[PDB]
Design a protein around this ligand. Structure first.
Ligand SMILES: OC[C@H]1O[C@@](CO)(O[C@H]2O[C@H](CO)[C@@H](O)[C@H](O)[C@H]2O)[C@@H](O)[C@@H]1O
Ligand SMILES: OC[C@H]1O[C@@](CO)(O[C@H]2O[C@H](CO)[C@@H](O)[C@H](O)[C@H]2O)[C@@H](O)[C@@H]1O
Ligand SMILES: OC[C@H]1O[C@@](CO)(O[C@H]2O[C@H](CO)[C@@H](O)[C@H](O)[C@H]2O)[C@@H](O)[C@@H]1O
Length: 468
């Protein structure tokens, strides 16, 4: 028997709902699907739908009912979705689809993407105060998984992540950023899975590696939760006690790996934490050297940005923690993966579905202690045919690094699909995510984006639901 939702979480949840219940209702974002075997016919269906939506009958029908009817057609090879809040946006977006023109709320392709999507599990720097709260209050499936992770983390570390999510006065530190983003990562993917989606492959980045192992079938949710919990409290306790000459900084620099090779001969104590993009690398080390390399970068007109931490993960500074990390993970059970893994721990190499288990106790030690080969994992996915990268996160920070690598690999038509984003309506965001999965032909039951009909008013008087 796991712990239940704490009383303080229930208390905070009630305050949040009363807050929510007294706000201005925003019009929901509705996906309108249209498709055909031929792009020409798809374009004609779009203009026909927009003609009718302009008619008095179409004006009197709700977007939700129009979208539900559309959701029930046959879904052809050439597809499009218009995301819309009202009839104008819809008609406007439909006119672009008909015209073959681009629009911010419009996705349209002549045919499906050929290979499945890669789920990107990062997190590093994606966090913000209220992340995940709105979707917890408003999506029952999301909320169920958050509470499930919240119960396991209560059991591992003795506190409630849900309390952090719901209490606006509270913010995130080295430790709680990791367990909370993890919880958000788990809940976003299960939400997606609930609507019929699934990863073709996963790739992770530091904190995200735990969730990637779960979505890859490499660890039970419990053992993935043990993996993120042990690493995160050790890191937060470790860097908390760092002062003076024990301080190691972390910074992003616009230097490639080959540049870093040359540049580090002047700085004997610097190490690579993350190969993020082909020309962006996260480095760590003593403050004097970190400051010097940044100064070298600025003078060379390159980007350099210091992070907020007195300790450097993925460096030798993690050596004191590894003994305890080992003890806390005794008992985990690695399992043969059920989708592909681009392992940025193991230098970015690919592990086939059904291969040998990788998510060993040694794997989590190596992951915390050593460099993250992110751009190599991504480059490897591109070179093996993947074009869709979907990032589960409260903010799509890693998708920026992914775009750098895909363009560098020559792939300019990449499907870069975010999930949540700060100051974007969290429900609208997920609508948009699942819309995009559909338009590109990935696994997604577009019918599940609409509540079951309880009346004829739930459909619009169009095919396939015309009224006799
Ligand atoms: O939720 C808004 C409103 O609720 C109050 C109590 O009436 O505070 C609740 O919500 C805060 C935000 O999450 C919590 O920090 C607080 O603990 C909780 O009681 C008001 O103070 C606030 O304006
Ligand atoms: O250890 C000496 C060696 O390392 C340098 C590199 O810049 O400095 C570092 O080591 C010092 C300890 O001896 C620290 O005080 C300092 O913070 C660190 O950058 C040079 O002093 C020399 O080449
Ligand atoms: O073409 C089939 C393919 O399309 C997806 C979405 O990309 O599912 C759609 O088509 C199904 C009928 O074949 C519908 O059941 C579903 O509602 C619709 O989204 C994929 O999931 C499917 O493999």
């Amino acid at each position: 028997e796991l712990p239940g939702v704490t009383e303080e979480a229930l208390r905070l949840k009630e305050a949040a709902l009363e807050e929510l219940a007294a706000q201005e209702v925003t019009a929901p974002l509705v996906p309108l699907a249209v498709s055909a075997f031929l792009t020409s016919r798809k374009k004609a269906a779009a203009a026909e739908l927009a003609d009718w939506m302009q008619s008095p009958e179409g004006q009197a029908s709700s977007l939700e009912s129009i979208g539900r009817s559309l959701s029930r057609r046959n879904h052809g090879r050439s597809r499009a979705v218009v995301l819309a809040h009202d009839h104008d946006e819809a008609i406007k977006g439909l006119r672009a689809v008909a015209a073959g023109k681009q629009a911010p709320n419009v996705f349209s392709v002549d045919g499906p993407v050929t290979t499945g999507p890669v789920w990107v599990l990062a997190g590093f720097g994606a966090q913000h105060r209220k992340m995940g709260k709105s979707l917890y209050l408003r999506n029952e499936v999301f909320a169920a998984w958050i509470e499930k992770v919240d119960a396991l983390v209560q059991d591992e570390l003795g506190y409630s992540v849900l309390e952090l999510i719901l209490d606006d006065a509270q913010d995130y530190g080295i430790e709680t950023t990791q367990v909370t983003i993890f919880a958000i990562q788990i809940a976003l993917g299960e939400l997606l899975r609930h609507h019929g989606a699934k990863p073709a492959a996963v790739i992770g980045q530091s904190l995200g590696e735990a969730a990637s192992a779960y979505f890859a079938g490499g660890l039970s949710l419990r053992d993935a939760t043990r993996a993120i919990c042990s690493r995160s409290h050790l890191m937060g306790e470790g860097e908390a006690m760092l002062f003076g000459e024990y301080i190691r900084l972390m910074a992003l620099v616009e230097y490639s790996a080959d540049e870093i090779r040359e540049v580090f001969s002047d700085f004997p104590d610097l190490e690579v934490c993350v190969y993020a993009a082909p020309t962006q690398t996260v480095i760590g080390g003593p403050p004097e050297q970190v400051d010097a390399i940044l100064a070298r970068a600025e003078a060379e007109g390159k980007f350099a940005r210091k992070f907020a931490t007195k300790g450097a993960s993925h460096t030798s500074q993690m050596d004191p923690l590894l003994g305890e990390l080992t003890a806390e993970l005794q008992g985990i059970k690695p399992t043969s993966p059920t989708c592909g893994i681009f392992s940025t721990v193991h230098e970015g190499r690919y592990i086939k579905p059904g291969g040998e288990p990788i998510h060993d106790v040694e794997y989590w030690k190596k992951g915390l202690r050593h460099s993250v080969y992110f751009t190599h994992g991504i480059r490897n996915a591109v070179d093996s045919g993947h074009t869709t990268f979907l990032e589960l996160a409260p903010n799509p920070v890693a998708l920026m690094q992914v775009a750098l690598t895909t363009a560098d690999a020559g792939l300019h038509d990449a499907q870069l699909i975010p999930t949540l984003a700060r100051k974007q309506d969290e429900v609208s965001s997920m609508v948009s995510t699942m819309a995009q999965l559909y338009v590109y032909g990935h696994d997604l039951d577009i019918r599940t984006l609409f509540s079951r009909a309880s009346g004829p008013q739930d459909y619009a008087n169009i095919p396939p639901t015309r009224f006799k």
